[PDB]
Each structure stands twice: as C-alpha cells, then as structure tokens.
Amino acid sequence: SMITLIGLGPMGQAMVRVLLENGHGVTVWNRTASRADGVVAAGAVRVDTPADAVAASELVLLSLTDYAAMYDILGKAEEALTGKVIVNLSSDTPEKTREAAEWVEARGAKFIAGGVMVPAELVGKDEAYVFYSGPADVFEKHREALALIGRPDFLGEDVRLAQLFYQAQLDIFLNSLSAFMHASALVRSAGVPLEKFMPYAKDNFEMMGFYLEAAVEQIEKGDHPGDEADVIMMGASADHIVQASRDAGIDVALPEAVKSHYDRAIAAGHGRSSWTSLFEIIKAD
Amino acid sequence: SMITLIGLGPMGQAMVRVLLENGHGVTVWNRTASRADGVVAAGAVRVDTPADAVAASELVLLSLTDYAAMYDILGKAEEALTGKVIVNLSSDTPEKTREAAEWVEARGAKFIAGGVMVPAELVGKDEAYVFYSGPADVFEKHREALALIGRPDFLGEDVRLAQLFYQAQLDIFLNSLSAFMHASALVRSAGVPLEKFMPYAKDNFEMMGFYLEAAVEQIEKGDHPGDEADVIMMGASADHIVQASRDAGIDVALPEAVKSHYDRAIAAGHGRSSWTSLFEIIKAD
Ligand SMILES: NC(=O)c1ccc[n+]([C@@H]2O[C@H](COP(=O)([O-])OP(=O)(O)OC[C@H]3O[C@@H](n4cnc5c(N)ncnc54)[C@H](OP(=O)(O)O)[C@@H]3O)[C@@H](O)[C@H]2O)c1
Numbered sequence: 001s002m003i004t005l006i007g008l009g010p011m012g013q014a015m016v017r018v019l020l021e022n023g024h025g026v027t028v029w030n031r032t033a034s035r036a037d038g039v040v041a042a043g044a045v046r047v048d049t050p051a052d053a054v055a056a057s058e059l060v061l062l063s064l065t066d067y068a069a070m071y072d073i074l075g076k077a078e079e080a081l082t083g084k085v086i087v088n089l090s091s092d093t094p095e096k097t098r099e100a101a102e103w104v105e106a107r108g109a110k111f112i113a114g115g116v117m118v119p120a121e122l123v124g125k126d127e128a129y130v131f132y133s134g135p136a137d138v139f140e141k142h143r144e145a146l147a148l149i150g151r152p153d154f155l156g157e158d159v160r161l162a163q164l165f166y167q168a169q170l171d172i173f174l175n176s177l178s179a180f181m182h183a184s185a186l187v188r189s190a191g192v193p194l195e196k197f198m199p200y201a202k203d204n205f206e207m208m209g210f211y212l213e214a215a216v217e218q219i220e221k222g223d224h225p226g227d228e229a230d231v232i233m234m235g236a237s238a239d240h241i242v243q244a245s246r247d248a249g250i251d252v253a254l255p256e257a258v259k260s261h262y263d264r265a266i267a268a269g270h271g272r273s274s275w276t277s278l279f280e281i282i283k284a285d
Numbered sequence: 286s287m288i289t290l291i292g293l294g295p296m297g298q299a300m301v302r303v304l305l306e307n308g309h310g311v312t313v314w315n316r317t318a319s320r321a322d323g324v325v326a327a328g329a330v331r332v333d334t335p336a337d338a339v340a341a342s343e344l345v346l347l348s349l350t351d352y353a354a355m356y357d358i359l360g361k362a363e364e365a366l367t368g369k370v371i372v373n374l375s376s377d378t379p380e381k382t383r384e385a386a387e388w389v390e391a392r393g394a395k396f397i398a399g400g401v402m403v404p405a406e407l408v409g410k411d412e413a414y415v416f417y418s419g420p421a422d423v424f425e426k427h428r429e430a431l432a433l434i435g436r437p438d439f440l441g442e443d444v445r446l447a448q449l450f451y452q453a454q455l456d457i458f459l460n461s462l463s464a465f466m467h468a469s470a471l472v473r474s475a476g477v478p479l480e481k482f483m484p485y486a487k488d489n490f491e492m493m494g495f496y497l498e499a500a501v502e503q504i505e506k507g508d509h510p511g512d513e514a515d516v517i518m519m520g521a522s523a524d525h526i527v528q529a530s531r532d533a534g535i536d537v538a539l540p541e542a543v544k545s546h547y548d549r550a551i552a553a554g555h556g557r558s559s560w561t562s563l564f565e566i567i568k569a570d
Pocket residue numbers: 006007008009010011012030031032033035063064065066068069072073089090091116117118119120513514515517518522
C-alpha cells in the first residue's frame with residue numbers, strides 16, 4: 001500500500017512514521033536528502049527526484065512551508081502528476097489554494113486541500129484532527145489512510161474551505177503565543193519570573209469557552225448589550241496595556257493593534273455596546 | 286461591618302451584592318445616582334457625596350474605568366481620607382498605580398491595589414480570584430471581607446504588582462477576544478456561519494496549556510530549539526493569515542502585529558529557532 005509524502009519537516013516526518021506504523025509503504029523525497037535519514041531507517045524509501053516520488057504512488061501528500069514550495073517541487077514532476085491525488089497539507093492563502101487546485105488539475109491531478117490542527121508530537125494521537133476540502137469522492141477513496149494522521153473533518157467540495165479553517169485556527173493560535181510572550185515580557189520587565197505568572201495565563205486561556213457561546217449569539221444577531229462589560233471600559237483596558245508596554249519598554253505593536261479595535265468601535269459609536277461590537281469594525285461589509 | 290464601595294458598573298454592583306449577601310452593611314456613591322437603585326433595593330445605602338461615602342467606613346473599595354476617575358471622586362473627599370483604607374479594583378498603569386499609592390497615603394489613608402480576574406457574573410463564585418498588593422498588615426486586617434469577592438492572591442508589598450498582573454491577564458484576554466472575532470470574521474467572509482467554527486476555537490484555546498510549560502523553560506533559559514516548529518514556517522503562517530485577511534477585506538492590524546513579531550525574529554536571525562525566540566524581540570532592551 002505505497003503512499004508518497006514530500007516535505008520532511010517535523011510534520012511530514014511524523015506523518016510518514018504513522019503511515020509506516022499502520023502497514024502502508026511510504027516513498028519520500030525532500031529538497032534536503034539527509035532529513036529523510038530518520039524515516040528511511042524506520043522503513044520509508046527515499047528517491048532521487050520529485051517525479052519518482054509522484055510516480056511511486058496514487059496518493060501524494062505534501063507537507064511544505066507554503067504553496068510556492070509545491071510549484072518549485074511539482075514543477076519538476078508535471079508529466080507524472082496524471083492519474084494522481086495531491087493532498088496539500090501546507091499553510092498558504094485560500095485564494096492561492098484554489099489557484100493551486102486549478103494548476104494541479106490542469107496537469108491532470110485531483111487536488112484536495114488539508115490543514116493539520118496538532119503539533120507533530122500529537123500527529124496520529126487522540127487530539128489529532130485535519131481539515132480537508134475538495135472532491136468528496138476522491139477524499140472518500142483515501143479516507144482510511146488520511147484518518148490515521150488524525151480525525152478527518154471534510155468541510156465541503158470548495159477546496160478553499162480547509163485552508164480558510166486552518167488560517168482561522170492559526171489566527172487565534174499565533175495571536176495566543178504572541179499575547180502569552182507579550183504578557184510574560186511585561187511581568188519579566190519588573191523582574192517577575194515566568195513560572196509565577198504562567199499558571200494564571202493557563203487558567204486565562206482554559207476559561208475562554210465560558211465567553212464564546214454568548215459571543216457567537218451577540219455577533220450573529222448584531223445584538224451587542226454592554227450591561228456586563230462595555231467598549232468604553234475595555235477600550236480603557238487596551239489603553240492601559242499599551243501605556244504599561246511603553247512604560248516597560250517591551251513591544252507595542254500587538255497591544256496597539258488591540259487598542260485600534262477598541263478605538264474604531266468607539267469611533268463607530270459602540271462605546272456603550274458589548275466588546276462583541278468590535279466584530280462590526282473587524283468584518284467585511 | 287459597614288464597607289463603602291464607589292463605582293457601580295457591573296463589577297461594583299456584583300461586589301456590593303456579595304458584601305450585602307454575607308452580612309456586611311454597604312454604603313455606596315456613584316457619579317450617576319440612579320445606577321445605585323438596584324443595590325439600594327438589595328440593602329445598600331446611597332449617600333449624597335463622595336466625602337460621605339468615605340466617612341461611612343474604614344474599608345473603601347473603588348471600581349472605576351481608570352485611576353483618573355479616583356482623582357475626580359476622591360478629590361472631593363481629601364480631608365475625609367485620614368485613617369481610611371482605599372482598595373482600588375480599577376485597571377490603569379503600574380506607574381500610575383504607585384503614583385496613586387503615594388497621593389492616597391499623603392492624605393493619611395492606606396492604599397491597596399487589586400485586580401479582579403472574573404466577569405461580574407462570576408464575582409463571589411468558585412472561579413473568582415483577585416490580585417492584591419500593598420501593605421500586607423493592612424491587607425490582613427480586611428482579608429476576611431475582600432476574600433468574599435474572590436480568592437485573594439496577595440503578590441507582595443510593591444503596590445504595582447496586582448496592576449502589573451491584571452494588565453498582563455487582560456493583555457492575553459483582550460488579544461484572545463480580538464483574535465477570536467478576527468478568525469470568525471475570516472470564516473464569515475467566505476459565508477460560513479460562526480456556529481460551525483466556534484467549537485474548534487473553543488478546543489484551540491482549551492489546548493493552550495499543552496505549549497505553556499515547554500515555552501516558559503525555553504524562554505527563561507534563552508534556549509529556542511526549532512526542531513518541532515521554526516520561526517520560518519510560523520512566520521510564513523503569519524504572512525498567510527495577513528494575506529487571507531487582505532483578500533477577505535477584514536481587519537489586518539492584529540495579524541500584521543503578529544507577523545511583525547515573526548519579521549523581527551527573522552531579522553535577528555531566529556529563522557531556525559523555536560517561536561519562543563519571538564520573546565527575544567518582544568522583551569525590553
Ligand atoms: N509545525 C507544526 O507543529 C505544524 C502543525 C500543524 C501544521 N503545520 C503546517 O504543516 C506544514 C508543516 O511544516 P513543518 O513545520 O513540518 O516544516 P517547515 O519548516 O514548514 O518545512 C517543511 C518542508 O518544506 C520544505 N520546503 C520549504 N520551502 C521549500 C521550497 N521552496 N522548495 C522545496 N522544499 C521546500 C522543506 O525542505 P527542507 O527540509 O529541505 O528545508 C521541508 O521538507 C507547514 O505548512 C505548517 O504550516 C505545522
């Protein structure tokens with residue numbers, strides 16, 4: 001049961017290993033031949049060329065930093081893409097994802113977009129899930145295999161959907177990392193150790209589920225009551241974090257961006273509305 | 286025991302109600318006399334003047350949008366402050382918090398800073414905790430009372446500590462709300478309802494604790510291994526969220542701020558380091 005995988009970053013590697021562990025034969029190629037050494041030891045079969053990698057399997061998985069990478073690699077293997085199934089598990093733009101769907105299918109391949117929503121350490125484990133979008137019939141044919149990487153959430157036949165859901169998750173995630181480090185940087189400025197603050201940050205993030213249901217209701221109904229907490233008070237909070245950041249001499253870009261949401265809401269007259277009203281100035285009309 | 290409280294936002298109100306529920310007499314004043322109606326019904330006693338509010342109790346709690354508000358109000362009760370204990374549960378800057386400590390003590394009162402780390406709906410419940418800082422001996426005298434609002438976490442005698450820990454929490458929190466709304470705004474741009482995405486966002490936030498321990502270790506040791514996930518790949522992710530945001534016509538300030546962290550890390554040569562390396566570019570010189 002030979003499946004190909006191209007791109008042997010942590011993810012590519014962790015995926016190749018799960019495919020090998022569950023009986024499948026796995027052909028690999030990577031720009032840096034020597035990164036494959038570990039998985040080749042485990043049972044994978046390295047090959048000289050990207051075309052050889054594509055020719056080896058029906059199913060071809062890509063784990064690459066961006067879609068530009070798909071073009072650099074598959075560009076040296078076009079004649080062999082015919083009859084094949086590209087599953088691209090790379091981050092890039094939804095718009096660039098569709099543009100990619102069209103190029104691979106013009107070269108005669110079926111294209112599915114995927115987004116893996118776990119670190120490599122948890123690929124193949126219980127917490128693992130993967131956004132997928134594109135041909136439902138082709139996805140079904142290879143579901144059993146892809147299901148090993150993590151729980152497949154098929155979103156629809158619009159190839160952009162998985163990428164859009166991936167960018168959306170990482171929007172929150174990269175924000176939470178940057179926010180965490182920013183808040184930590186504020187406390188370390190006054191000489192507090194990170195280990196004394198981290199438990200509070202943990203609770204902070206773990207408590208987010210409490211707010212999210214009321215938030216979705218308020219946002220979809222355009223109903224933003226400030227009774228519990230208004231944009232004037234939370235705008236002031238944003239102003240304080242910015243000014244504390246300048247006082248401490250840490251980064252101001254991230255808190256100035258949060259303040260800008262409150263500033264635009266205030267300008268739009270949502271002073272007395274719920275913080276959910278920020279959605280009105282964030283969204284596309 | 287009569288405890289005074291000034292500022293009858295949702296917080297002030299929820300705190301007054303808990304004090305009344307646990308036997309305490311509560312004197313109130315507010316710039317907007319009619320906001321007291323609810324708590325006066327519940328048992329509180331409104332008074333004409335801020336000076337009267339201060340004179341009524343040993344312990345005086347402030348729940349105000351900012352510290353500037355404390356000055357406007359307590360400014361009309363300067364003579365009345367001798368012997369009193371101000372607990373300021375308002376957001377403002379650590380620097381403005383100390384400057385306030387000194388102003389209050391100059392007028393013969395003890396000053397404690399506090400940060401309440403729950404919404405009004407959870408004041409007095411299990412999840413409730415409150416950062417406190419200032420004189421430990423004065424804090425002990427009034428601990429039993431304040432303990433009702435939420436679990437008191439006394440940080441130290443540096444009055445700024447509670448404010449610093451509050452700003453830090455809201456730094457992450459306001460970021461998480463803005464990120465959540467931003468990601469949601471991306472999904473609604475392609476016409477997906479927010480109810481389809483919210484469960485994934487909930488899991489995303491609930492999963493933050495997994496990364497935070499490894500993060501603190503890597504940050505405090507200046508040890509940033511990229512083996513599992515490097516700043517080149519996560520910088521590219523940030524670029525994708527920004528470009529998807531421009532494509533969708535939503536806010537770009539928040540993702541452009543996250544991208545700016547990755548861009549500065551890359552500039553500092555941390556391309557191949559862990560995302561924890563962003564801390565090097567966020568932290569003070
Ligand atoms: N890191 C995580 O925990 C995680 C989790 C979920 C999803 N993801 C996403 O899934 C993918 C996993 O990436 P990763 O962190 O494992 O690795 P990465 O650092 O993004 O790079 C992975 C692969 O991309 C190749 N590559 C990049 N640009 C190329 C180009 N122009 N030409 C040829 N090859 C190119 C690399 O070649 P070399 O090895 O030769 O450099 C490598 O094999 C990414 O798209 C990421 O956004 C990551």
